[PDB]
């Protein structure tokens, strides 16, 4: 659910989202790393976890619209930075 | 199973001339022929080919023909005239992956175990490498059918050889991009390959044409990679990825700053080497 | 004596220990070329500045 | 279990596995299962389930070889303790980034000074790297300075990305040829 | 290649010169002396040839042979490229020390002599601009290709 | 040079009326060369040399100590040059006007900043020019 900007949740949020105490979520996430459903790292003193990879799920005809529009302005970025190269190095090779 | 394929430019050319020889049919014909080669060291090699007589009618397009006597005797001649050479599989002219190529491969696998196919180009326009090859894998799995079999692309490149490199470099004699210096990389993959990434961004834009309107099978196994690409989209510019980037610019440019400093002194020593040959001949010669 | 490297604290005696081989090869082995090339331009005076 | 850690031990668990007739003992099928898998609950929660079967069965004499000579037993009580106090420290280095000193000693059920003597003789053994503290209790695992590996691992992620965008491209163009060919 | 065809040795007996040159297109390529030692030109002749070239084929051996896909959108052994930026520069110091040597023995013996004499050992001057091209294109390519992936990839 | 070299001796120092000990000794000499109108304004550059000199040396210095060292005779504008030192941008850090100390932050990694490339890019492009000028001026024969 979280974006790729942070995806860095805390242990207190799991204590809210799973109503389980603080002294068991570390035992929980070490199981989750062992099975292979998630790939991330665990801090203990700043009480946060750096999740990096999550298991791919399925999605309906609405999340493709998210992959529609997030893909679409990545087209012009490949266009824009290349347009310098065919203009600035044009005489270097015709 | 197979690392990669190696294609010579002869067999690359030895389909085009046959595509000319059947070009007088006008209406429709795909060139399908027998591919010969000798795979060694887990690397697929392709050496020689011909083409077998092959026709196709559009209504009930499951009816193919391979004149196997033409396949028997001419390979028997080719096994005679080159016993190093053998069968390696087959090919077809491959514009758009026609439908009969699901059992053509199964028709003639009783000769080659890994009967590989090769898709070539007759009208060249791309930014990639216009030779494609697949492999035969089968599955009783996933979701689709009890009997399921789909082709998978093993990577492809055009191998050279000391005999034929004499030939092709004599046969080009055309516009060339030799003298690889600071500029060949700028145009082989900095002008070009950035636009090469266009037609792959735009290729997955073409599958995206089914949001509510396109073809009826939806996703299942296409979006696990697309979910990963936005997940494996690289790191943002906040960390020492900012700082260690300025670090190496502050190291790579110092070598350029030394090397350009040398360039000025060398040509200055050349300048005196022309002032030794200017003044010391006008009094001598006149 | 540089047999060990670190730092010593005076208030409570805290030894912050750190290590890195920083870099030596890239710069000073490229720095001495500059003073070699300075002597080459000095030797250009003995065939150009005197001569033409 | 009792052997020191090695690559030879890392497939020794596989050489003893794949045995149809070893798994007839329901206990010892789980014993090697514990050390192929994830974290092991302290030491006390295991000995209440496994420090009692060493009498039972028809199998007691190599366990009597554990039990009988008590100085051989003391070498084998503690080395069995040594492998399981180590089994945490492998994967806590692997899956954590920065843990407190108090938290680790609680998962070992022993003194915080006794925890420091454990991490001392493993990193002068340099088989688990760690940079501990004795003022904030803040230790961390696999934390070098990293001058060059940032952009190096970044360049790795490009090539993994660019190999994947080529995977889908020649997989779409065949998928349009199985619906609208002719 | 030089395709041939026979001429009659009966007209060699006649001393009569065949083939009746009616166009300035034959005597363009000169024969080798070694082929002239053999039967040319007493029993056969040479033929000028060329090649039938067409977009049917010429476009599709050029735009099919020397092509690549990723060799340039990728980086190059990032901890070792900067390491290779010392593997050249280190001996480039002492190679410049030879360039801090060889100019100093000028205003001396007539540098046409400084061509024949220096054929046992390597000169600085040509070798000293050799690495400058190498130490440039290895850097300018690798610096530019890294600074596009910052823009394109997020 | 000796009257004029003694002038820049005062500039590399941080003293204030050392400027006045020159401008009475050689105030007549500067009007012979016709340059006095530029000489008279160096007191802006003496005090910005000094405030860079003191802020880099001392980290947490009282503002009622810097004036006695610069012989400013007044702490009440010793805050104020530091205000124009930050307005011009000589030193960065803050002033505890309630207490009286001027603290300065310690410098950080200037190596991993973009600015040494700006020391390069001026000179990368310059050194390629002189290699080009060595080409353009060579082949007259």
XYZ file of N, CA, C and O in Angstrom, chain B residues 17 37 87 153 162 164 170 195 213 250 267:
44
model
N 17.983 -14.759 -50.512
C 17.971 -15.153 -51.911
C 16.819 -16.095 -52.222
O 16.254 -16.031 -53.316
N 23.672 -27.001 -38.742
C 24.662 -26.467 -37.831
C 25.153 -27.546 -36.888
O 24.725 -28.693 -36.943
N 22.193 -31.569 -39.037
C 20.984 -30.802 -38.758
C 21.086 -30.168 -37.378
O 21.742 -30.691 -36.469
N 12.331 -17.455 -25.774
C 13.435 -16.905 -26.540
C 14.756 -17.066 -25.808
O 14.949 -16.514 -24.721
N 36.652 -16.177 -39.422
C 37.822 -15.614 -40.097
C 37.717 -15.742 -41.613
O 38.233 -14.901 -42.355
N 34.663 -15.678 -43.304
C 33.590 -14.831 -43.805
C 33.785 -13.357 -43.478
O 33.214 -12.513 -44.178
N 34.510 -6.941 -47.347
C 34.594 -6.551 -48.741
C 33.227 -6.255 -49.334
O 33.116 -5.422 -50.236
N 17.042 5.703 -27.652
C 15.897 5.430 -28.507
C 15.625 3.943 -28.654
O 14.553 3.571 -29.138
N -11.103 -2.290 -22.855
C -11.583 -2.383 -24.224
C -10.944 -3.490 -25.048
O -11.578 -3.956 -26.000
N 34.562 14.326 -8.663
C 35.752 14.940 -8.097
C 36.977 14.017 -8.153
O 38.015 14.344 -7.568
N 51.597 19.405 -27.988
C 51.464 20.184 -29.211
C 52.302 21.453 -29.178
O 52.642 21.982 -30.240
